[PDB]
């Protein structure tokens, strides 16, 4: 029953537990590429200004 | 000079028009970092694409 458990478990946090550095690889991805994106929005909502030289 | 058009203006329009619909077309791909987002610009990438994304999960 001893090592059976542990098997188990062995199984159990494969299935559920995660592995950080797959984890943090993507957040890392996801935080450049939310900083990409605010930063183009920003220099989206800009864009429609050069309309009124004209006016 | 004939003054009922301004045909330096009409061409001038046209081509800013133009520059900026380029514009919005390198503004959203930069916002969403992917080469191409919506169709017609790569199909054939596209398709490939999507056949490796289903192989990779």
Redesign the interface.
Known sequence: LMNAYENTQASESRIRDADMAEETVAFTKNQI?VQ??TA??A??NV?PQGVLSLL | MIINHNLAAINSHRVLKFQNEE?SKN?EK??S?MRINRAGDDASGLAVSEKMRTQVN
Do not use: K, P
Request: no cysteine; hydrophobic share 55%; aromatic share 0%.
């Open positions: 590429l990409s994106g183009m929005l220099q989206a864009r | 514009v503004m930069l916002s970092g």
